[PDB]
Design a protein around this ligand. Structure first.
Ligand code: NAP
Ligand code: NAP
Ligand code: NAP
Ligand code: NAP
Ligand code: TMQ
Ligand code: TMQ
Ligand code: TMQ
Ligand code: TMQ
Lengths: 250, 249, 251, 250
């Protein structure tokens, strides 16, 4: 029987690359998405064309709220419903936007989105994954630049730091169950659709190893390593995949 | 005119020692409290007996909610109302209890643990900066964030987030001359709520004297960071842990 | 045409497992050794039985001295003489013993051995490796997951391993324009000494959250193989803990 | 009655400022120096004019060699010879220059100077200080930029990383003797005339807090705190005094 994985925010970009590589490795996949329904369905269609009945989509908002625990439980339930097991959880979904300290969304909403997606949803997903339970593991998508953060991104940075804390705490606590918990920390990988080429190039020029951003596949490669049998003693580790960006002084 | 400081969770224990030392150093102080009204007022009475009209109290729940931003704005406003200025913010108040991953609702635990340790510090930081000399913020962190207590994930998440706030706010508020630093205790003032067996077990782990920190020793590092002797220091977290975090399993 | 790797301290234990896995992956290997000649040669003979002319040995003391730079240049040169190329360097060789700060080796010898093997030799080997490269080139340094929670009375050892982290970062930064990646693997508790009492071994094993056991040499080698692979080609300046969670455990 | 301190590389710049502040605080001081004999003797004269018999100079090369242990023992011995006690050791002396990995000093000399001054001499001085033994402590001058080093400074950076390791290891091991071991990590401070004006200006503009370097006195202020009674539970801590420099991404 093939193992099964949940990847959050998997419709596009890094999440899609992770889902694709897991699928190529032989996993059945739950493609979680929030707004990108067409892209999620397009991906699931492609994966099911390769191997029938090996991909499903699952919609959920991962903003913090009193129903978030139930939503996260349902994402894990959806993997069991489709595939009868859940071996791997990848916490990839993430809100990212500035929240300046000095001056449409209310600050309450910004907290709920930035802390919810980057930290609280991963925590609740981790609880539900563990409660339901071989090579079991969780991979959290972190950020290599958390100690040298983008200016005016405090709430986002708080969220990613909290995710490091979760990775460590959950690795410690879930080790007796044989559930490994690790992270992959990109530097600059895919730049946003909205960003102009000149701004993209400004970031690219900072990277020592090739003056280019990580491909989505390069990020996925590290995730696949951590979920593999080649990482079976690794827990509580966060692997930077940043081309040396974090080593470069101001 | 004397500078003024807000200390959250200042009625007891480390917060109280911080408020006392700031006041002894010459600050006027806002003593924030949640449940400990009697102790907050007793502290204010003590400090005001030393110097009239130099200590006030301010009540607020720092749990995350729809009203937390307003509560935090009002804590900062209370300092400006009482004293006409706010030079120092100490983010000390903190919920701390286990939240096991496998088996209050969990969402209430998120609100309390992440609210007190991270979101309230952020909102207080925003309000402090917006309302603006030796201005600074000190966040009470945790020397054991990378070797956390078992089954304290949400607490540990909150303290990690507070490290991130310390760094992000240091970076962003530096142009305004506002420094942002942290003090990271190991074990300090182990409470009655711990058993004597657990208390001795922790104390014996501490390389420097096999004892916990006093609240005053924690306060000493806060006083340094707000002082003129720290005017180039921002984004720094000082462990006050007697070497505890250096000790392997 | 097959790539080539130098592994220092490759006769036994973790270095041996790394050399074996690299060879299984398709590398030709230089098996460096200091005192363990019989084991280095037995490994080479095993690997050459698998594929002829794919393993050589190279003897050197990696203690710090005025001749260390020449010794390290010669190790790298040996790979070029054997195989015509040198694609991977693994800095594994390491002295490890206590050096108490307070009350038969002299302290200058302990400095030389502990700082030489763990830090200075890796630096000189890195220099020589890079100079010959003035494709998937990379260096892997064997670090230590417990450098911030060190064994009592191991100051010089711990200094050496911290220095090795600094080399990893500095060399990653500087060698990036040459396409040479520089990374680390940081064991927690892996192979214990055979002569250590099982009761003492078990004291260490019981500390490890993930399985209450030490890492095998092969599990350490798995992380090295990942870092030198095509699946790690954007990774430089990273140190992967392979510690079963040990470093997360408070006192 | 008055406690005594050894400060290495104390003739000039940051070491001088540390020696002056310790002296103003009530310490008797050993002013160690290597080449700066005239400055060392002038400083001792200044401090002795303020309080007689409270300062001496001590010359030593702190380059690694087989005689370095004897030299370090002699520096501590010089404190006992002059003052009858040695309460504080400040490891400040430091060689700093590039050592590129790819191509008048030989590489062995570069290793000896950079690793000796920044790491091995601090270790040997720490040994001798501890063996010869209240508020006893050691302060190591570290570097806030150890994880974002200057390009082509590998040996220097290795030395400073080793000094972090010593700070931790010695804090752990010397705690039972009541000796605290801490560090102060500058970013940019008191940029020297020898540095080109253009390079000085470039580094100053990187610093978030005031777009300026630290004065020597600001560095010394952190050393004074760590040796004081207000730091009596602090050991194994390294305090950045960097104006936020280390927080700034490339
Ligand atoms: N790209 C980089 O340079 C970079 C750098 C450092 C770290 N990372 C990390 O790597 C991961 C992948 O990066 P990325 O650039 O591919 O991410 P991204 O495009 O910014 O976001 C990934 C997905 O997150 C989902 N998401 C956002 N808000 C959500 C919410 N409220 N509820 C549920 N899902 C939500 C979105 O799903 P829908 O589209 O379905 O709405 C989105 O497609 C993230 O964790 C990111 O922080 C990336
Ligand atoms: N003690 C230690 O060993 C230790 C170790 C590591 C870190 N620290 C950090 O050092 C700081 C001080 O420690 P401590 O032991 O003195 O703290 P504490 O006694 O656990 O808590 C301090 C105060 O926090 C306030 N607080 C708790 N929940 C709150 C809420 N929902 N809203 C508003 N205020 C709330 C309480 O105020 P009221 O009493 O008025 O309700 C309480 O008196 C904390 O940030 C702690 O995390 C302490
Ligand atoms: N084992 C663990 O639990 C553990 C934990 C943390 C980190 N590590 C790291 O992982 C690596 C491998 O560990 P290990 O236990 O396999 O190492 P090890 O057995 O202690 O030593 C490996 C080899 O180092 C060589 N070596 C020692 N001194 C030398 C010198 N002066 N010159 C040249 N070579 C010298 C020896 O080669 P010869 O036998 O030929 O003389 C020895 O076989 C080391 O870097 C170690 O620090 C291991
Ligand atoms: N300045 C900064 O921006 C900065 C930044 C980061 C870290 N730091 C650290 O802060 C400390 C003070 O910095 P600084 O700029 O004042 O240092 P510095 O001027 O570069 O050097 C301090 C003293 O080190 C002594 N020294 C050099 N080589 C020696 C040797 N072989 N043997 C004995 N002593 C030797 C010299 O003494 P003589 O003159 O008597 O020969 C020199 O005056 C150093 O540890 C430095 O690494 C400084
Ligand atoms: C510094 O400013 C910016 C930087 C970047 N960098 C690339 C980028 C893209 C998507 C991302 N998405 C998430 N989930 N998290 C990130 N960390 C992230 C990053 C790092 C993207 C921006 O646009 C969204 C931006 O704002 C203009
Ligand atoms: C592991 O279990 C426990 C550990 C401790 N340790 C001391 C202690 C006390 C108060 C604290 N209060 C806050 N805000 N944060 C902390 N970090 C903290 C700590 C660290 C105290 C306990 O009782 C309060 C306890 O539960 C029985
Ligand atoms: C703390 O005491 C000890 C601990 C260990 N632990 C396992 C072990 C074995 C070989 C090692 N070899 C090197 N190169 N570096 C290490 N880090 C290392 C370690 C970590 C091995 C000991 O004996 C060699 C020992 O001494 C009794
Ligand atoms: C990257 O190039 C350079 C950088 C700097 N930076 C300031 C500076 C000055 C003295 C220093 N001295 C020591 N002991 N350690 C340092 N860390 C140090 C630094 C950090 C100074 C230079 O000239 C003195 C220089 O060379 C041109």
């Amino acid at each position: 029987e093939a193992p099964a994985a949940v990847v959050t925010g998997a419709a596009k970009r890094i999440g899609r690359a992770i889902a694709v590589k897991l699928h190529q490795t032989g996993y059945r996949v739950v493609i979680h998405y929030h707004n990108s329904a067409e892209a999620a369905v397009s991906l699931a269609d492609e994966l099911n064309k390769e191997r029938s009945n090996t991909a499903v989509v699952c919609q959920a908002d991962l903003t913090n709220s009193n129903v978030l625990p139930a939503s996260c439980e349902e994402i894990i339930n959806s993997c069991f419903r489709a595939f009868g097991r859940c071996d791997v959880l990848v916490n990839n979904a993430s809100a990212f936007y500035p929240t300046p300290l000095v001056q449409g969304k209310t600050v309450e909403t910004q907290v709920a989105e930035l802390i919810g997606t980057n930290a609280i949803a991963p925590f609740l997903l981790t609880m539900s994954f563990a409660q339901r339970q071989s090579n079991l593991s969780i991979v959290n998508l972190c950020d290599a630049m958390v100690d040298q953060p983008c200016m005016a991104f405090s709430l986002y940075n708080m969220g990613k730091h909290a995710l490091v804390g979760l990775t460590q705490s959950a690795a410690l606590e879930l080790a007796p169950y044989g559930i490994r918990v690790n992270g992959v920390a990109p530097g600059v990988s895919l730049l946003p659709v909205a960003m102009g080429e000149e701004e993209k190039d400004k970031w690219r020029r900072k990277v020592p190893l090739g003056r280019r951003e990580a491909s989505a596949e390069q990020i996925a490669d590290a995730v696949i390593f951590l979920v593999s049998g080649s990482a079976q003693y690794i827990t509580g580790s966060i692997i930077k995949v940043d081309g040396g960006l974090s080593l470069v002084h101001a």
